[PDB]
Amino acid sequence: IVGGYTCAANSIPYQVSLNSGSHFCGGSLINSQWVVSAAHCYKSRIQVRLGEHNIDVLEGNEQFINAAKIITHPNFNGNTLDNDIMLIKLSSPATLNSRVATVSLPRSCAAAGTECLISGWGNTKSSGSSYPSLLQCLKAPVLSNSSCKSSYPGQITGNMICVGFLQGGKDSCQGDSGGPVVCNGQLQGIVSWGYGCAQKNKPGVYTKVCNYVNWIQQTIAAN
Numbered sequence: 001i002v003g004g005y006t007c008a009a010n011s012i013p014y015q016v017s018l019n020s021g022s023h024f025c026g027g028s029l030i031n032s033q034w035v036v037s038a039a040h041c042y043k044s045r046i047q048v049r050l051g052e053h054n055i056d057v058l059e060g061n062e063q064f065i066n067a068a069k070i071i072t073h074p075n076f077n078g079n080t081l082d083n084d085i086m087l088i089k090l091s092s093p094a095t096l097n098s099r100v101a102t103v104s105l106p107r108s109c110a111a112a113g114t115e116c117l118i119s120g121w122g123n124t125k126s127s128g129s130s131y132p133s134l135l136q137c138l139k140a141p142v143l144s145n146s147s148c149k150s151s152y153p154g155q156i157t158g159n160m161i162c163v164g165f166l167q168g169g170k171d172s173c174q175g176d177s178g179g180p181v182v183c184n185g186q187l188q189g190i191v192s193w194g195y196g197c198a199q200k201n202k203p204g205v206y207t208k209v210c211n212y213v214n215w216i217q218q219t220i221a222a223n
Ligand SMILES: [Ca+2]
Pocket: 052, 053, 054, 055, 056, 057, 058, 059, 060, 062
């Protein structure tokens, strides 16, 4: 997260870290057994870490559960990043409590101008770098379709929204991928792609979760 602030500890209880040796991508818990993330984060073996705040220290609230099943969207496209969404089934259920909680899926798509919260342990710098120990947060608005498509001519599909600031300085980055964009209590975006991070006139682009609720539900019911 560039240009954010350190979240209060355990204040984002649906945030997960995906770990294969190290943190590599975020995710969101959407029920006891299932995490959602980005398909471009795919790896064959993934440990899910719930209840985290500081990813380098054991604090005593964490639950570390291995993935049992990893399912990428069948129409994911590696070139355009369309359908950048993946589901992970945990090998046992997360135990839900004050530090570990589900986020709701969208009841509808969100209006332009809606304020959202973006979170993650990704890079915090542009002209340098530095991956943080502590979870970072960022409030940013959903941008209109026009401001998004003018930024990225020909490359925004109907499954993608822009969230962010056209003046730069504030954005998600490498290592935030797969993590949540939550707006009015509802998961509306997954961190997906961008040109760089926090550049003027190149806001982050996010998978548009309100197009995928049928796919998520059908996949959970079948697996
Ligand atoms: Ca920890």
